[PDB]
Amino acid sequence: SEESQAFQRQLTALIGYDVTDVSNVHDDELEFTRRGLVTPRMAEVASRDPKLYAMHPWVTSKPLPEYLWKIFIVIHRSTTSQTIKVSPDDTPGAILQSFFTKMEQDFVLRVCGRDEYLVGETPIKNFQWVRHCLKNGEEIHVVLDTPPDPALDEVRKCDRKFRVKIRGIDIPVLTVFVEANIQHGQQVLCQRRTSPKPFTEEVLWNVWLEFSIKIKDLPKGALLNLQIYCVRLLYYVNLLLIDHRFLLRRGEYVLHMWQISGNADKLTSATNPDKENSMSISILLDNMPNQLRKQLEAIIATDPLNPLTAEDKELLWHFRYESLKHPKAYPKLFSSVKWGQQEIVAKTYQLLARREVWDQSALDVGLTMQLLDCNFSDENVRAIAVQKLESLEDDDVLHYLLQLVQAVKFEPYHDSALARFLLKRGLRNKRIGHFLFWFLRSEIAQSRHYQQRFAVILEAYLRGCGTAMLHDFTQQVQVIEMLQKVTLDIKSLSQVISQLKQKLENLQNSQLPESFRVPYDPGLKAGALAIEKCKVMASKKKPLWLEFKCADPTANETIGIIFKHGDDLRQDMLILQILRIMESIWETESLDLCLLPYGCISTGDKIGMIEIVKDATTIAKIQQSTVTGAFKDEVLNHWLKEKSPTEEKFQAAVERFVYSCAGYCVATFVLGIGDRHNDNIMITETGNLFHIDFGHILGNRVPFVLTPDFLFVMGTSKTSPHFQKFQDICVKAYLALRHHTNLLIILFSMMLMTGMQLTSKEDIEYIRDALTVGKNEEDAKKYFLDQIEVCRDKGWTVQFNWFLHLVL
Ligand SMILES: Oc1cccc(-c2cc(Nc3cccnc3)nc(N3CCOCC3)n2)c1
Known part of the structure; x- marks a missing residue:
């Protein structure tokens, strides 16, 4: 047509x-x-x-x-x-x-x-x-x-043993061998390796790797992992041993492999697009006592990052019908399964059929998401988690939308319950669909590994959002594409702003649509751009500071947006979304810590847009605008007095500060990103504090930033009333989060697995120490205060060091 x-x-x-x-x-x-x-x-x-x-x-x-x-x-x-x-x-x-x-x-x-x-x-x-x-x-x-x-x-x-024939690898440009693994949920079932041979533009083995496993014992979702060595790993590629139609795979296969640069990408069932420079491989396929109750309760009641020993899994499996009574134990129980054994798998389904408890149990998101991580490849196990998600209302769906979109990478097959779920919730809600649009377009535009799977999903959505939505997206995308080129062209280069004013003027001409919808906040329509207000920033990344007139006359404040290339705004998006989650958690406990999760949308490879907080400046600037590494305590407070004349206003900004400072102190602490610098922490003229550029910190000691200029503002030299008001909040806000350890943990895990060569055997297990897991609530209170004490003792120490590091 x-x-x-x-x-x-x-x-x-x-x-x-x-x-x-x-x-x-x-x-x-x-x-x-x-x-x-x-x-x-x-x-x-x-x-x-x-x-x-x-x-x-x-x-x-x-x-x-x-x-x-x-x-x-x-x-x-x-x-x-x-x-x-x-x-x-x-x-x-x-x-x-x-x-x-x-x-x-x-x-x-x-x-x-x-x-x-x-x-x-x-x-x-x-x-x-x-x-x-x-x-x-x-x-x-x-x-x-x-x-x-x-x-x-x-x-x-077939009852015969599985076997694949490695024909050989083709190199584009000493010693090498192929490792053929059979994975399922990141757990290897069997492993075979070829003989080593000197490097050549075409190494041909032509060998039949026989495996100990049998065809029938192959679980749907099992990957055939092929890896090349020299010992070090070079290329890797995957292949579902059972295709989307439940059919066992057969025939000749030539696979272009992804390269290592030493993680979620490791799992992708996609092949390397670039065939020119990709190493290739060709293959051929042609085929209940009280104690043991008390003993596992400890198992069930332990963090998701606590590995299950051999005995753990056996005990957990033998009493599976008793373990199936505790919903908070499903992840553990299904980790105790021998997927490489058909008889065992068949039983687990008999087990799943008896979900009397899991179905009627109150929705636990932290628990739900766990069955969606890389640890589970069984479409049926994963599907019971999505069923619980059906219970979510849009508001909540919007909270975990980002984390869910990422969890799509852990799916064995493209079409899936999780995939269809997002498509359904996005098509019912224009606001959810909007973000779904950009969250997907982001991955497609910087993930060769999952851009195919994602692109298919997005296309399925665009065909349903309606005509209106398509137009908005069209004008949004058009605008965004223009601004991105300007961002790059200028980063390649006061002669600068004269160049910006020039280029920007051309875009303003007639090419651009009259008014477009702000991606990180679709509630807003940005119209005419104010060129006289646009300026390039003084960072080495040299980001653009742009402003638009509000397309709605019945508002005339300017919409401030920043376009930046250099950092990966995906890391930022994840962090910011976690903050929004924390706020909701605190909200349930009647807690408002005035966090400021500004808008941020990744638009492509290490490039995207960021919301501007009005009347907000950097803490570092304040210390150096008044006083460079030198740090005075009074400077911060003086800045408030000035920026807030009315005593009524000033007194309220201090109330807004103590809370915001407590919020970010606890929030950053748990996420292990509190140790920052003045230049990375901002504050509103209205006393609202907030951190920024999270892609920079985690992308590259003091628990968190609590410098004497802050304390001075609270009235501490000397335990002021406000300071007690501060530490009282911190504790309350800290113990609150702890009641969601599991959630914060799994989010933390899925944040690095799909957001960051970050060691999961170490870094991932930092939040455990931070959340004082395995310690009574009372004991936890003392720890946080001790962490505060660390700040009192270091004072300016840490900051001065950051001043050195980020200068030398
Ligand atoms: O997440 C990221 C990543 C990279 C850069 C940033 C980033 C850097 C930055 N720098 C700045 C601004 C003004 C003066 N001096 C320095 N400002 C903001 N804003 C967002 C909040 O509202 C104020 C402007 N975000 C934020």
């Missing part, structure tokens, strides 16, 4: 990858998956309420934080600005029908400046926007607008 061609062409443009490409494939799993997903896509399209899907009301079911539990709304019909008081449990329609008396009722209550609507049968106390404005004590300004026409959300019409 004429249009169908320009369609697939438009898709590819948005995707950043051509899915109809078939040059880098040895089978049809991808094409098979493209077609498989057609059902979930359309099945979801025809289920979503056109109205609710078009307005995407952002709501929640969770209770209201006590601190907030302790109101009126403004309206803006043109010149008319009627101000009305409403009961908390009033439907937006009831409030609307209430405005009908105090004055074709086919209108809707939108938000001033943003694309956020207040619709549906939901008490206004359940709209995240209202809740947000309360944690700020701001007036809820609503513009009486018309409902958006949903007509724009329409879519386009």
